[PDB]
Every structure is written in C-alpha cells, then in structure tokens.
Design a protein around this ligand. Sequence first.
Ligand SMILES: CC(=C/C=C/C(C)=C/C(=O)O)/C=C1\CCCc2c(C)cccc21
Ligand SMILES: CC(=C/C=C/C(C)=C/C(=O)O)/C=C1\CCCc2c(C)cccc21
Lengths: 214, 214, 11, 11
Amino acid sequence: EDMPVERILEAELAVEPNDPVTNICQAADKQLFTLVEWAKRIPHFSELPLDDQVILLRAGWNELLIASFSHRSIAVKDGILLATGLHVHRNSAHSAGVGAIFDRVLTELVSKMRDMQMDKTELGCLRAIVLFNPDSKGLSNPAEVEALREKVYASLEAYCKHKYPEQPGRFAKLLLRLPALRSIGLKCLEHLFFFKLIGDTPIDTFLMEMLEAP
Amino acid sequence: EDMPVERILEAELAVEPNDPVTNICQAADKQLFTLVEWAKRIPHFSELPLDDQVILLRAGWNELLIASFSHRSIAVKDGILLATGLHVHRNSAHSAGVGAIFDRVLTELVSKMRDMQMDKTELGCLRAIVLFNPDSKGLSNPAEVEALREKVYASLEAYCKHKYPEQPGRFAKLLLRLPALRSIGLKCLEHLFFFKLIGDTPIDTFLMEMLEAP
Amino acid sequence: KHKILHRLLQD
Amino acid sequence: KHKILHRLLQD
Ligand SMILES: CC(=C/C=C/C(C)=C/C(=O)O)/C=C1\CCCc2c(C)cccc21
Ligand SMILES: CC(=C/C=C/C(C)=C/C(=O)O)/C=C1\CCCc2c(C)cccc21
C-alpha cells in the first residue's frame, strides 16, 4: 500500500549509468558504498531502525551485488562487466582457479536474465525483495520487514502481467531465480573467506568489514 | 498443459500417512527409498530419461526431504517428527552440537509453514518444483525440465487464488520459502559430509550413495 | 555408479 | 562494530 515500482526503478537508475579475483574484489568494495545509497532510495528502508538497516544489508549485500553485475552483463559474450569498467572473461576466471563458480553465474543468472529479457524494474524489485529479508537474524521487528517484502512482490506482480500480459508465468519465473541467487551468493562468500584466509588478494576496508563476525 | 495438482497431492498422500544426529541420518536413509516412489508418482517424471531422473533426484533429495519433515512437524512444539516415528526436540539437537541448523529449520521453515497453514497440495507442488530443477548440471535436456517446472507452478498458482482467493500474495509467499530451503539444504549437506568425515555416526547405504561424488 | 538409485528407478 | 556501514547509513 505504498511501494511504487517507479521509485524502485529510480533507485536502480540512480546508482548505475591482472588477477581477475583482485579486480572482482576491488569492484565489490567500490559497489558496497553504492549499495548503501541504493538501499536508502528504496521506499521505507530508511524508516527502519538503523540496527535493522545494518542487519538487512550485512545479510544481503553479496546477493544484491551479484544480481546487479549479472544483469549488467547480459550484453557480454562469455564474461561479466565489473562496475569499474573492467570485463572478466570466462577463460580468465578459469585460468585463475575460479571457473566453477564463474560458470554458475553465467549459466544460472546472466544467461537466464538475458533469455527472458529481465528489465531494470524487475531487477530492482527482485533486489528489493532480497533486501527486505525477514529471515535475517537479529531483526527487532521481522514482521515489519516481511510486510515490506510483500508490498514489493505485490507491485512486481502487478508490473508483470500489465507490461507482459502474454507471459502469465513471468512473475513466478523471476522469483524462481532467487534460490539460484542464494546458492551462488553463499559460494561466493566461501571464496571470499578463503581469499582472506590465504592472505593473497587485497581486500579493501568495506569488503573486509562485511567479512567481519558475525 | 498436463500437470494436475490432484496427481501431486496423491503422490504426497501415497508416500506418507539416543544421538539425535544418528536418528536423523537413519530417518533420511529410510526416506530416500520413499522419495524415489514419490518422484515416480509425479506426472511426467518417469518419462524423462533415466540419467536425468537420477540427476534431478541426486540434486534435490536433501531439499525434498527437508521440506517433507518440516511440514510434517507443523504440529510439533519445539522440534521435528522423523519418518521413523521419533521426535527430535530442539534441546536435544542443541545438546548434540547441531542447534544452529536445527533452529533455522524451525524458524525459517516449520514455523512459517504453520503460520500460513501451508496445505499438502501446496507442499507437493513446491517439492515438485524443487524436483524439476533445470539448473541441475548434466541434464541432457534442461529445457524439458524447465517446461515441467513451469507447468507445476502454473497449476499451483491456479490452485491458490481459487482455494485462497482472499490471499492474493499466497502464491508468491510459497515460492519465497524456496531460497530458505536451498540455504538450509546446503548447510545440512555440509553437516552430513562432516559426520561422514569424522567417522562417528552410522550412515546407511542409500544416504552414503547420495554423498558419493560428484 | 549410483547403484541403488538406478535400481529403484528401473523397478 | 561495523563502523563504515553505520556512518554511510547515518549520512
Ligand atoms: C561477492 C561478490 C561481489 C561482486 C561485486 C561486484 C564485482 C560488483 C560489480 O562489479 O558490480 C562476488 C564475488 C566475490 C569474490 C569471488 C567471486 C567469484 C570468484 C566470481 C564471481 C563473483 C565473486
Ligand atoms: C539431509 C537431511 C535429511 C533429513 C531426512 C529426514 C529426517 C526425513 C524424515 O524424517 O522425514 C537433514 C539433515 C541431515 C543431517 C543433519 C541435519 C540436522 C543437524 C538437522 C536437521 C536436518 C539434518
């Protein structure tokens, strides 16, 4: 009852116009700052208590960033476009020892988004649904977060069916990429903790903070 | 165009009327046999090539079993009911060193299913969607699997809205427990591999086979 | 491989 | 804890 897809699309358009791993980590740190600005532009997020805003972002940052560069990469051959303007080719990822997870991103996310021509409004809404994760531990008022999530998917469904009336299964198709996003995000986190453990690979301050306990 | 929720409900009704970890693993092995019978009763599954039937089950067995005992446990205070007729209380899980994952099952799955009164038809459909996972690696014809998944969620949506017209967001709410199911299933797998590594905890033949590589 | 699963699916 | 995130959210 107050979650316009126009404000969500606006949030998306407002924040976005040699070792591939090192480049990926640098891009991630860069985008973490941008992610906070994005969240603030999502309706009602800023009205939640600071502690819950922190919880939601710490809980969803990895999936939020993955969804974003994956959609940005729909126009890329076999690779991804980093927010830094750098492209990471599949062969480069493979030659760096991270080909398996890279291939999952290309196959389960990028290719699927390109195939259904997921638009920016839809991406923004899926990210907003991820942001408003009621399962996040520590939330002072999980019911409030759940309420916001419901408002987002209610608006997204309305958007679909009205924009794509001929694709009745589109709304479900969008939501069904979330389990893949959750799995891939978890794997990417594992890689990050390993990079941090090994010592090699520079990890900037905001990215490092997100890897902080809990 | 040939995925009746009645056949799915039938499949569900047809297969179901001291260390808690050991009991949980024994229940899982037991249910793996039952899972194969369930799958065969899901429309069109048996018509897929044997190699793909194997792939889909090896890829989704853990989430499929978790969804099942979680729904079975909606009537339990603070714990779960195993297919063996044994109950695992939260305190028991905690005292065995597996309280964290146990609590996630209770909070993210059981409690949520109880809160929305998820019915057996809905459970069956969600499990069928999980079964028909087009992202499964090795599939000879992923498009065919994707087609079946679409038919399942198309029928589920129809079921909802018709059975629960007053809850327009129910269909989305059901699909949105899948990311939680995916995360919890992955964690449970990790625990199983550790139990297998440590040596303690008897692991039966079918469960052991599922832990086989890949 | 996967002896058990194949057998149960075939039967 | 989480110095950076809090600062960016507050500003
Ligand atoms: C967590 C994450 C964030 C990505 C941020 C980026 C690259 C944002 C952007 O450029 O828009 C993705 C990672 C973390 C490091 C490991 C990794 C690999 C090996 C492949 C793909 C993604 C990721
Ligand atoms: C993978 C799995 C299967 C469960 C099967 C059961 C218990 C089926 C049933 O009883 O219906 C769940 C596990 C595996 C071992 C670790 C585990 C823990 C520690 C808690 C909850 C579930 C599980």
